[PDB]
Amino acid sequence: ELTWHDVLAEEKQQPYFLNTLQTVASERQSGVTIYPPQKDVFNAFRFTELGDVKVVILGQDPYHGPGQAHGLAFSVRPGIAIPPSLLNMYKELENTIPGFTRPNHGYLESWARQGVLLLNTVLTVRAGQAHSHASLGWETFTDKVISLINQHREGVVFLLWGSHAQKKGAIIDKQRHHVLKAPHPSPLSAHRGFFGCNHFVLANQWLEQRGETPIDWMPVLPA
């Protein structure tokens, strides 16, 4: 019964946060194409409430191409080609969960509805230039978000792939939450340990063993 608003009300107004929004809005005004659209900017929190967080997967920044990003980490819009790292994620799930079969689409809403917070460390990007909005103030914000879940929740699973993600993990109390790491699903490092980390399964076992319902890892296209 605790909403993101309850724990984020104050922060919603502190300096940096309004500055960040102002900044992101000004670029838009001068004519810069920023992804994703704002209505989508905070979709991760729209789909997954504070009380409903079970598993958490960290992202970096939004897909800088068009039509791609829509507010959820890794997840693309339907009709868009499955990104390299997501496709590799898919293979693992294929090789770890019996019956699981490649979707043919990268739309991950159903995962959010189930309690999966696909949060990106940075929430916006300048069309074309990847990592353009680093140091705009976003990290500070999401940084806080993680710190809020870590202090206001218990028995949450954190899936940190790559050095970057694992670094933000430093905050999470390993006694209070389940922290699982592994190399990024990126083709570059996928084979160096991401494949066969059984994360999706270890994440579900813990959930069950804690009286929680597991996560149907098969992404469904809503209607």
Binding site: A81, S85, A130, H131, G162, S186, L188
Partner: protein, 82 residues
Amino acid sequence: NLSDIIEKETGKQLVIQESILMLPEEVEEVIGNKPESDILVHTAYDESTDENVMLLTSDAPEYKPWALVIQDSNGENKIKML
């Protein structure tokens, strides 16, 4: 745009689908060579030849080309220092 650098180096007219940020130790592992700073792995997929072409540039706003890596379906990659 780093697509032109790709094409210019492989005659491949591909479109980058993702750019992941990776630290010097991560990349030093696979590439076996340690970059001086965080490098971005712009990844494009060549469906024609079923391989994943990735370009390694420095971080924004530099975006300087560091290496090109072409991995095939086997998971083995051809590394080319730029």
